[PDB]
Design a protein around this nucleic acid. Structure first.
Ligand SMILES: [Zn+2]
Lengths: 331, 219, 207, 241, 329
DNA sequence: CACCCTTTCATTATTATTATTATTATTTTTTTTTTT
């Protein structure tokens, strides 16, 4: 269906980048050693070939959410809002391996290389959810194909062909956000504040003496880990316009209807991470279906054939297909 | 005219498992030139000896072309190429339910059969290739100008020739004998590198039906 | 983009080594190159400057050198007046030189309408000279907003457009011959990357 | 000794299965043996099941299996000869590293046939050429043909010893893959890049891929001395009959 | 007959490479042992001899897609977009070996050397599809040659020797994309989250204690049933890069060039190098030069109408009996 | 009959790694058109 969805993040995006990154107090990423450095958890970056100047084509970092990530997010929204509600209003139920297959693709690791039957492959790829997420122990090819979240940015001009030259950002696109993590009993000030702690003042002062002894240990090591940890993490700035390309190689109308009903549940969902700091909230401001704009503020108001197809396929949903999907041939 | 061919190639080629005679290459170029001339439906055995190359005759028949096998001067380290043949199991399931496909069996087998995923690693060299031969020049020029690539499995794009140069050299300066010839071949031409093997001396060097005892070098 | 739009075009390697920074030294060197072009011209010549200051500097360096032949376009001289003037001097048999800008870059018919059926003897514009790459030549509100959105890509893009419109003055119909094109901006022949688009239009001519 | 199928009637003495047809007409080569089936010789029609993936290495398009090949296409022959050394007297197993060392350094003098499996078993017995001369050897490995020169192999052993004289830890000069499947199979190690001479580095690239696969077998830390195989001809005969 | 298809990968390229490649938590690739190292399958890479920076050529890395993958992609785009609809409308169906020769080109129809008559060889090479991808038991020569997808890069600059120095990439080409699977029975936590489980709370807790015991067993093993948590890496080619694609047809028929052109028309809905879930290989065709003259438009191929007419008559004439005669006999 | 399915064999034995290196910062000044 070549679904293109533009979602405006109204809070920062923090899909953390694995690595060991540092930052000085000023804000220089990965400083030369010897200066006082604090750990920085950067957002997810991809290098992208982009037009800087004119024909000077270069790999610049563009800050994204991974396609694996938002793919998992797409699965969880449909699973949380369409599949399992329609699976528990009836008496159907899922084994723990089949829940693990419906969520993680596979019930376990160590997959069986014994393949699966042709009637089976056809019936799972005709399924509303399993044909989208073809996991299982015998590894299906799911027909749902999910893009990384791209900011509509001048560095993503080669990714996004035309129609996105307006509402398109440029320049630096991130912000380093710091966190303190203050030890709580240092904030303790009176006998009224300390009455809930067992022993009151004696236990509080004992942890104080532990903290100062650990401070002498740290000063001895420089020249057991406390609760003061002041660090940084880099987020993508809020209010950016992003594009998301869902792709479906010859879908059943119920399957793209499942994508569209998931998109309906896309609101009040979190994109990337930073769940304590409300990062990853967003609003969809566009959905296009074969390039046709099918998003109003109320909802989809379109794609009706896919909607009734996924409706008919979710009263027809049951746990037998999920269980025979999760069943391992060796086990 | 007693000339050496060197050929420099753009993409790396597949490292030849057995010594490849230059004569075999130019026989294929004559075959493709005939396919351009006399159409597709032609027997390749009529033109694959029609070469601008002279003929050395062994004492009991067993004529070979005056060419040599290509010697490799490596510009790059050797590597190994993986390729797989896997039939698309998913597409076959869709075609089986649709009825376009007519296979009674419902289960594929990656070990063997139609849906055998198969993985094979072939050696890869990027080099400069040198061959000695005894032969006129301009026919070899026209043939190697028609020649686009060198190496095996060209349908996946390997070993395209960036350029070639073909030039005369002295009579003692070129051992063209670095080549698979009948064992009954004269001693002058057999060196210490040549050894007895079940080798092809002519034409199709893969035709195992025509294979016979021969003195051949190793690539 | 037919071949005959570039086939009669004559491309010269000679240029002005001084970059145009509205300096006097550039204007003397560019005036020397323009005098060379005017001497080798067997017909009308249009040099295309970008700025009024560059045109005023060229005029002060070329007026006494070229005598009556010089035509300058300025605040008090429009492009249409100098158009009729250029046609009048080519009617009179002398070879005019034009220090043109503004509308002289885009939208002027420099083909003879006194020679309708024979383009082989069309000789209104024998020499076209580009003194400077036309950067920053549009300052409308919408284009400044578009520059603020896209960056230098919009400016280099529109500069290439103005460059191709200035280069379109040479050939207006098939059948003309011995058309001379000159570019004297030193960024054409330097190794700078941002002037890379103005190579490839330049690469459509030869020798 | 001329064809690979000669390891059916000269060694491992077996008869025809006698459900095989006798050949008639103008002679053609066997698809697997590369041996011409002549008039009065026993053949089977090519009854290969669809699992047979060695259609690529068939000698001819005759669709006619010689009876020697029919014995070679038996499964006891397929797993039995998967890791063995073939000589005019009998079969020796090449499975041991020392067995491999004995094969590529001081080989047996007979026109033998060297077959080694890249997997559980495949059909490699009928697709490799026989080695009339000790110096040039045709090794079948998986589905790929190989050439080893023993003189080149011993020379590479002498250098792997020579750069490793006087140091406690054995460091290989150049990595080779035993399966010959890695991209680095053939690539010189950094330690070998510093302990390897310009002529030596160019020699070590100059070896054929069979010698790369060979020297993977004997280029490890505990260098294998050449030791003769234990007999497998009697085992194979027992498994066939 | 040379076709030069220059494409732009909208999404990244990941053509998985053999080998147990290793990577630290940082970007260090294949570290020395004794450090915490992670599994990694990089993209396909080869050492190419590039004349970069000086007069000598050096082995530089160049990450591409193999030409076998590309030939298969072209074969499958013709199959699904042209052979499927035209053949399906007629009503013809394909056997074991007919489908194996069309889709895999493998000899499983009959796994012995088919003796092919010259008339059969001439008309199946004159057939469009069997001309392009001959093979299987009949062992037929392919008219169609696919070069591998080379990016317009300094490392491939001599492969692209003329006319590709503009819009030409330099520097690093690949980037490590990390993927973690984790246990979703770690990601539960409400009573409403667990009523959907067969066994429910006790089943989830039994999974938990199984994971705990597996963790203690692994920790005692370091000093075979694994769980679901899996943190790994894969090196991918960066998106937006222009790749070249050389398609050489050795004396083709006109219907063959029309078939390749229809594949290049309808190729936009298909992907390169796998990585389907991550949706890698998404791309758009920038240009197609047919013998050097540009013929690609945004809406397909404009021009080459004789190719389109020849392939139109051929696909009206397309029949499965030719596939069966290429397969069985 | 063709096809489709289930289970036998071997015992190899260390295991180098690409040490390549990884996130930016450049111009510049027209004077049109032919609408209410
Ligand atoms: Zn036989």
């Amino acid at each position: 269906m070549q679904i293109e969805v533009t979602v405006r993040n109204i809070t920062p995006i923090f899909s953390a980048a694995p690595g060991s990154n540092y930052i000085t107090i000023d804000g220089t990423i990965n400083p030369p050693p010897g200066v006082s450095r604090f750990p920085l958890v950067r957002t997810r970056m991809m290098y992208v070939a982009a037009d800087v100047g004119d024909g000077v084509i270069k790999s610049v970092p563009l800050q994204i959410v991974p396609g694996n990530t938002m793919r998992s997010l797409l699965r969880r929204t449909m699973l949380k809002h369409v599949i399992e509600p329609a699976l528990v209003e009836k008496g159907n139920k899922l084994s723990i391996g089949a829940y693990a297959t419906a969520y993680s693709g596979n019930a376990t690791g160590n997959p069986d290389g014994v393949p699966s039957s042709f009637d089976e492959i056809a019936t799972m790829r005709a399924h509303p959810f399993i044909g989208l997420f073809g996991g299982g122990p015998r590894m299906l090819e799911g027909r749902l194909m999910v893009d990384s979240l791209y900011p509509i940015h001048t560095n993503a001009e080669r990714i996004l062909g035309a129609g996105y030259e307006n509402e398109m950002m440029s320049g630096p696109i991130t912000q380093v956000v710091w966190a303190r993590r203050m030890d709580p009993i240092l904030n303790l000030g009176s006998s009224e504040d300390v009455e809930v702690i067992n022993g009151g003042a004696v236990a509080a002062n004992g942890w104080i003496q532990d903290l100062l002894a650990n401070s002498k240990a740290a000063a001895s090591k420089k020249k057991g880990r406390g609760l003061k940890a002041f660090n940084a993490h880099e987020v993508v700035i809020p209010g950016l316009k992003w594009v998301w390309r869902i792709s479906l190689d010859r879908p059943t109308d119920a399957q793209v209807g499942l994508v569209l009903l998931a998109l309906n549940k896309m609101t009040n969902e979190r994109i990337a991470g930073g769940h304590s700091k409300d990062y990853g909230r967003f609003v969809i401001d566009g959905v296009s279906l074969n390039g046709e704009q099918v998003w109003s503020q109320s909802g989809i108001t379109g794609g009706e054939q896919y909607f009734d197809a996924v409706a008919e396929a979710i009263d027809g949903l049951s746990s037998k297909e999920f269980e025979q999907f999760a069943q391992s041939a060796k086990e | 005219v007693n000339l050496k061919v060197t050929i420099d190639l753009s993409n790396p080629m597949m490292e030849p498992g057995d010594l490849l005679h230059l004569d075999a290459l130019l026989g294929a170029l004559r075959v493709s030139r005939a396919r351009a001339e006399h159409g597709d439906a032609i027997n390749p055995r009529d033109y694959h000896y029609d070469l601008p190359l002279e003929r050395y005759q062994a004492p009991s028949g067993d004529w070979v072309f005056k060419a040599s096998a290509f010697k490799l001067k490596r510009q790059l380290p050797n590597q190994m190429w993986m390729q797989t043949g896997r039939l698309s199991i998913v597409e076959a399931a869709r075609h089986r339910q649709s009825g376009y496909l007519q296979l009674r069996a419902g289960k594929p087998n990656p070990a063997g059969g139609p849906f055998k995923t198969s993985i094979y690693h072939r050696p890869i060299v990027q080099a400069e290739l040198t061959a000695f031969c005894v032969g006129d020049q301009q026919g070899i020029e026209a043939l190697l100008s028609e020649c686009r690539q060198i190496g095996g499995k060209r349908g996946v794009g390997f070993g395209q020739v960036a350029g070639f140069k073909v030039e005369p050299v002295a009579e003692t300066d070129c051992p063209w004998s670095w080549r698979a010839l009948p064992a009954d071949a004269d001693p002058r031409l057999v060196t210490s590198e040549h050894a007895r093997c079940i080798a092809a001396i002519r034409g199709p060097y893969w035709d195992r039906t025509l294979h016979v005892e021969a003195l051949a070098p190793t690539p | 983009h037919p071949a005959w739009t570039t086939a009669p075009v004559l491309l010269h390697k000679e240029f002005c080594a001084h970059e145009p920074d509205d300096s006097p030294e550039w204007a003397t060197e560019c005036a020397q190159t323009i005098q060379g072009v005017a001497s080798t011209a067997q017909g009308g010549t249009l040099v295309l400057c970008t700025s009024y200051q560059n045109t005023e500097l060229l005029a002060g360096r070329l007026g006494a050198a070229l005598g009556d032949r010089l035509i300058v376009q300025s605040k008090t001289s429009s492009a249409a007046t100098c158009l009729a003037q250029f046609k009048a001097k080519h009617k009179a048999g002398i070879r005019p030189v034009w220090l043109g800008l503004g509308a002289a870059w885009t939208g002027i018919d420099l083909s003879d309408h006194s020679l309708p059926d024979n383009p082989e003897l069309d000789r209104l514009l024998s020499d076209l000279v580009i003194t400077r790459i036309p950067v920053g030549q549009n300052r409308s509100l919408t284009h400044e907003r578009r520059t603020a959105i896209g960056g230098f890509r919009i400016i280099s893009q529109e500069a290439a457009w103005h460059f191709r419109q200035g280069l379109g003055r040479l050939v207006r119909r098939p059948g003309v011959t011995h058309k001379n094109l000159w570019v004297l901006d030193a960024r054409i022949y330097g190794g700078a990357a941002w002037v890379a688009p103005f190579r490839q239009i330049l690469d459509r001519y030869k020798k | 000794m001329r064809y690979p199928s000669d390891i059916v009637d000269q060694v491992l003495k077996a008869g025809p299965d006698k459900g095989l047809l006798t050949w008639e007409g103008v002679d053609a080569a066997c698809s697997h043996c590369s041996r011409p089936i002549q008039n009065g010789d026993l053949y089977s029609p090519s009854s290969v099941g669809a699992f047979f993936s060695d259609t690529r290495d068939l000698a001819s398009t005759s669709r006619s299996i010689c009876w020697r090949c029919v014995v070679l296409r038996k499964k006891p022959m397929l797993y039995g000869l998967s890791a063995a050394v073939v000589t005019q007297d009998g079969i020796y197993s090449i499975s041991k590293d020392v067995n491999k060392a004995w094969l590529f350094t001081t080989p047996p003098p007979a026109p033998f046939l060297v077959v080694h499996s890249s997997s559980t078993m495949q059909h490699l017995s009928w697709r490799t050429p026989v080695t009339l001369d000790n110096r040039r050897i045709h090794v079948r490995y998986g589905p790929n043909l190989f050439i080893v020169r023993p003189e080149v192999v011993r020379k590479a052993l002498s250098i792997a010893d020579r750069v490793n004289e006087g140091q406690k830890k054995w460091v290989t000069p150049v990595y080779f893959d035993r399966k010959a499947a890695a991209m680095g199979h053939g690539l010189i190690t950094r330690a070998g890049a510093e302990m390897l001479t310009q002529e030596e580095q160019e020699f070590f690239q100059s070896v054929t891929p069979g010698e790369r696969w060979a020297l993977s077998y004997l280029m490890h830390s505990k260098r294998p001395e050449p030791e003769v195989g234990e007999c497998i001809t009697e085992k194979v005969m027992t498994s066939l009959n």
